[PDB]
Design a protein around this ligand. Structure first.
Ligand SMILES: *P(=O)(O)OC[C@H]1O[C@@H](n2cnc3c(N)ncnc32)[C@H](O)[C@@H]1O
Ligand code: NA
Length: 336
C-alpha cells in the first residue's frame, strides 16, 4: 500500500531517505516521508538530498511528488529496477559514496550488471570513504553473495567537489548467511596519509603520531595533484584474522596535524578495546545486505543511532526482524 515514514526525528533527508529509497526500489513498495528536516534553519530537502532522490528515480523509473528544494514532504513510487550505465553529480554539497549507498542495493536486484559513476565530494567526515567501501565493506558483501567493486578515480576534499567514484556491480545469484563475532588476532596495522596541496611535513607528523601509539606494519604517504586539494586525510587499517576494518580522519583548517592524528588514534584504541570484529560504522552498513539475505549476525561494541535507524527502516519494508543482545560489553545484532 503506502508506507509512511516520519522525517522530523532526524535523518529524514539522510539515512532514512537513503535506506527507504533502496528498500522501496527492491520491494516495489511506495513510501512517503513527511516533516523532512522541519526544524533546521534551511529546512526540507536540500540539493544533496534531491540528488539521491533523482538518482533513485533514474534507476527504477519512479513517479515522485515533492522532490523540490525546501520540500518537507516526498512521495516515491518506484517502477522496475533496471541495470545500466549511470552517471550522477552531487557536487560539493554531498558525498559520492552516499549516492552509491542509495542506489547500489537496488542494482543488486537489477536485470543485468551496472556501472554507477558519481561526482562530488569524496573525503567528507560523515560518509564512508571509497577505500572503506572497497577494503572493508565489499569483502563482506562478497561473503553474503553480493558482488560490487568500487574505485575512486579522483579526490574532492570536503568541502569542495570535483571528486569521482565509480562502482561496478552484478546482480546477486545466491545469498549466503554471514556470521561475524570476535575480531580474532591482529594480522597487521597499516597507516596512510593522503595530502593534496598540503606540505609534506604534515604527513610526516601524522604518521609519526600514529607510530607513537601503534606498531605500524605498513606506512603509506600519497601526495596528490594540487588541484585535487587542498586536502588531507589520515587512515589506519586493522587487518585481523576475521575481518579488515579501517578508520579515518579528515584534516580541517585550524586543526594541526598532531591533533588530527590523535583523533584517529583515540578511535582505533576504542575499537581495539572491545572484542568485536565489526566497527561502529560498518555495523550500520551491514543491516540492509543482511536483511536482504534474510539471515546474518555480527557483534558490535556500541550500537549507533544509524544502526538502529537502519533496523527500523528495514522492519517497515521487510518481514525481517532484528534481535540485539548485550553480553559483556558487546551487542550481538542478529536476524531472527
Ligand atoms: P552518519 O550521518 O554519521 O553517517 C552516514 C553514513 O556514513 C557512514 N560513515 C560515517 N562516518 C564513517 C567513517 N568514519 N567510516 C566509515 N563509514 C562512515 C555511516 O556508517 C553511515 O552509513
Ligand atoms: Na542528513
Amino acid at each position: 500500500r503506502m508506507i509512511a515514514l516520519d522525517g522530523a526525528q532526524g535523518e529524514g533527508g539522510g539515512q532514512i531517505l537513503r535506506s527507504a529509497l533502496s528498500l522501496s526500489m527492491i520491494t516495489g513498495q511506495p513510501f512517503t516521508i513527511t516533516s523532512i528536516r522541519a526544524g533546521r534553519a534551511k529546512p526540507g530537502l536540500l540539493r544533496q538530498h534531491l540528488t539521491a532522490v533523482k538518482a533513485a528515480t533514474e534507476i527504477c523509473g519512479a513517479t515522485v511528488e515533492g522532490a523540490e528544494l525546501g520540500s518537507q514532504r516526498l512521495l516515491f513510487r518506484p517502477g522496475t529496477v533496471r541495470g545500466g550505465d549511470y552517471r550522477f553529480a552531487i557536487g560539493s554539497a554531498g558525498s559520492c559514496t552516499l549516492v552509491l549507498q542509495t542506489v547500489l542495493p537496488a542494482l543488486w536486484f537489477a536485470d543485468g550488471p551496472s556501472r554507477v559513476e558519481v561526482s562530488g565530494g569524496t573525503d567528507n567526515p560523515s560518509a564512508p570513504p571509497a577505500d572503506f567501501i572497497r577494503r572493508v565493506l565489499e569483502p563482506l558483501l562478497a561473503k553474503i553473495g553480493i558482488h560490487q567493486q568500487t574505485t575512486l578515480l579522483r579526490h574532492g576534499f570536503y568541502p569542495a567537489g570535483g571528486g569521482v567514484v565509480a562502482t561496478e556491480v552484478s546482480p546477486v545469484a545466491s545469498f549466503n548467511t554471514l556470521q561475524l563475532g570476535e575480531r580474532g588476532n591482529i594480522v597487521q596495522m597499516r597507516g596512510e596519509v593522503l595530502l593534496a596541496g598540503v606540505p609534506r611535513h604534515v604527513a610526516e607528523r601524522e604518521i609519526a603520531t600514529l607510530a607513537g601509539s601503534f606498531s605500524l606494519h605498513e606506512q603509506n604517504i600519497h601526495n596528490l595533484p594540487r588541484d585535487q586539494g587542498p586536502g588531507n586525510t589520515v587512515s589506519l587499517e586493522v587487518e585481523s584474522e576475521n575481518i579488515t576494518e579501517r578508520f579515518f580522519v579528515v584534516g580541517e583548517k585550524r586543526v594541526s596535524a598532531e591533533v588530527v592524528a590523535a583523533q584517529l588514534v583515540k578511535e582505533v584504541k576504542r575499537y581495539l578495546a572491545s572484542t568485536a570484529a565489526v566497527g561502529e560504522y560498518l555495523a550500520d552498513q551491514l543491516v540492509l545486505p543482511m536483511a536482504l539475505a534474510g539471515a546474518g549476525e555480527f557483534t558490535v561494541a556500541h550500537p549507533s543511532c544509524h544502526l538502529l535507524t537502519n533496523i527500523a527502516v528495514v522492519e517497515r519494508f521487510l518481514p525481517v526482524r532484528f534481535s540485539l543482545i548485550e553480553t559483556d560489553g558487546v551487542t550481538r545484532v542478529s536476524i531472527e
